[PDB]
Amino acid sequence: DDERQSIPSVLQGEVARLDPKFLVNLDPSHCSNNGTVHLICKLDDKDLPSVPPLELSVPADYPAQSPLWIDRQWQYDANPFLQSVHRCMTSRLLQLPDKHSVTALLNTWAQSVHQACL
Amino acid sequence: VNLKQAILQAWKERWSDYQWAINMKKFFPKGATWDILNLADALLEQAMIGPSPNPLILSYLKYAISSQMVSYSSVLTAISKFDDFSRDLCVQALLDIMDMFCDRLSCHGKAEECIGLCRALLSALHWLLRCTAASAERLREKQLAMCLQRLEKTLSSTKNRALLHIAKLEEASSWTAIEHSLLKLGEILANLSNPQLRSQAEQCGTLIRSIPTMLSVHAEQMHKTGFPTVHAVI
């Protein structure tokens, strides 16, 4: 009894049922066995897009702040608007108790990106 | 054909400048062909503009280079023949944005798109070589200092060195022409501009010359120990 064919089923099974507003794909495979996910998402809706997240998860206990903003500094200091957007996002994240990268993180990110227009 | 009325509508009004992304996505098929994006709008607008910085558009340029086709932007800012005009006002902003663009890293294209972008940035460096020529007179060194500084900056090792090597091993004539232009620029730079000037340019020239030399030159030293290998084998 072992997978031997793909990533943990629960994660892909749950994210596969998300909205079509998002788009998931894979980066260079640096999370082959343990991370099992390196996703890039681009919000496609009636709002301005932004830099995609990293989305690297941990085992199903999910104490995982999957995105870490590798390109935070320059890509977010490029413009003040998206900088304030990022600030609002970060302020909203900490209130989430035991957030879930699969649903909660992306949902809050989309909510903040859509509220960005104030 | 839609791009014409699109850019007309864009410049015609002072929009929120962030709702532009939404307006474009709505007005465009959102994935038909992104080769008709803002990539060429900047140049086709600045052509007629000439001696004008064309504000309110650099914001769009930034909101594009945030996440768009970096390759097209690169090739189009490379082939931009502004050295002849030498406005020193728009090309200044161009080099400024190119600095932060090339600072961190490029993106993946899952193809030889990376090599194409490398050839593009090589042509862009060739273009930058004319900065000292456009600043030789300077009767009406500011641009020269910044241009040579960005030249020195772009030479971060272990990041682009292999890419430049690949580019040089993919075509030679362009590289030989760039080297000849560098030699000519160094020769024309034989005037006593300043202490820092005409001195660091030679350093960048030697660095460019060493670019195709090798990537793993043996620079170790302080090996104070009699090697018994040769002794024993002999």
Q: Which DSSP helix (H) or strand (E) runs through B23?
A: helix B20-27
Label residue B191 exposed, middle or buried (CB < 10 Å: 0-12, 13-18, 19+): exposed
- Contact flag A79-B62 (C-beta cutoff 8 Å): yes
Q: Which DSSP helix (H) or strand (E) runs through A12?
A: helix A9-15
Q: Give backbone dihedrals phi and psi of A25, rounded to 5 degrees, phi first.
A: -150, -165
d(CA A68, CA A95): 17
Instruction: Please choose, from the candidates B135, B150, B152, B153, the residue with its C-alpha nearest in 3D space to the C-alpha of residue B194.
Output: B135
Q: Does B31 touch chain A (CB under 8 A)?
A: no
d(CA A54, CA A70): 8
Method of determination is cryo-EM
CB atoms within 10 A of CB A16: 8
Q: Does A117 touch chain B (CB under 8 A)?
A: yes
**Greatest extent of chain A over all pairs of C-alpha atoms, in Å:** 52
Give the single-character DSSP code of A104: I
Interfacial A residues in 29-58 facing B (CB < 8 Å): 42, 44, 46-52
Rg of chain A over Cα atoms, rounded to whole angstroms, equals 15
Of B21, B59, B108, the CB nearest to A49: B21
d(CA B46, CA B24): 20
Pairing of strands A24-26, A39-41: antiparallel
Q: Give backbone dihedrals phi and psi of A24, rounded to 5 degrees, phi first.
A: -115, 135
| Cα angle A108-A38-B73, degrees, rounded to a multiple of 5 | 85
Q: Chain A: residue nearest B16 by CA?
A: A117
d(CA B212, CA B169): 9
Distance from CA of A50 to the nearest CA of B (A): 7
The amino acid at B66: S
d(CA A36, CA A17): 19
**Alpha-carbon torsion angle B106, B110, B112, B113, nearest 10:** -50
d(CA B46, CA B81): 11
Instruction: Please choose, from the candidates A118, A95, A116, the residue with its C-alpha nearest in 3D space to the C-alpha of residue A43.
Output: A116
d(CA A1, CA A117): 50
Distance from CA of B30 to the nearest CA of A (A): 9
- Contact flag A81-B67 (C-beta cutoff 8 Å): no
**DSSP secondary structure string for all residues of B37-94:** SHHHHHHHHHHHH-S---TTSHHHHHHHHTSS-HHHHHHHHHS---TTT--SSHHHHH
Give me B224's structure tokens: 């104070």
Interfacial A residues in 60-89 facing B (CB < 8 Å): 71, 74-75, 78-79, 81-82
Helix (H, G, I), strand (E, B) or coil at A69: coil
- Contact flag A75-B66 (C-beta cutoff 8 Å): yes
- Contact flag B104-A71 (C-beta cutoff 8 Å): yes
- Contact flag B21-A46 (C-beta cutoff 8 Å): no
Instruction: Please choose, from the candidates A20, A11, A9, the residue with its C-alpha nearest in 3D space to the C-alpha of residue A100.
Output: A11
Of B22, B30, B104, the CB nearest to A48: B22
Instruction: Please choose, from the candidates B93, B124, B129, the residue with its C-alpha nearest in 3D space to the C-alpha of residue B201.
Output: B129
Distance from CA of A93 to the nearest CA of B (A): 23
Q: Give backbone dihedrals phi and psi of A39, rounded to 5 degrees, phi first.
A: -105, 150
Which residues from chain A sit within 8 angstroms of residue B100, using beta carbons?
Answer: 74, 78
Residue A110 CB partners (closer than 8 Å, separation 6+): A21, A22, A43, A45
Q: Which DSSP helix (H) or strand (E) runs through B228?
A: helix B228-233
Are A61 and A101 in contact, with CB atoms under 8 Å apart?
no
Place of tokens 């362009």: B174
Instruction: Please choose, from the candidates A113, A45, A38, the residue with its C-alpha nearest in 3D space to the C-alpha of residue A81.
Output: A113
**DSSP secondary structure string for all residues of A14-44:** HHTTS-TT--EEE-SS--TTTT---EEE---
Give the experimental resolution in Å.
4.7
CB atoms within 10 A of CB B62: 16
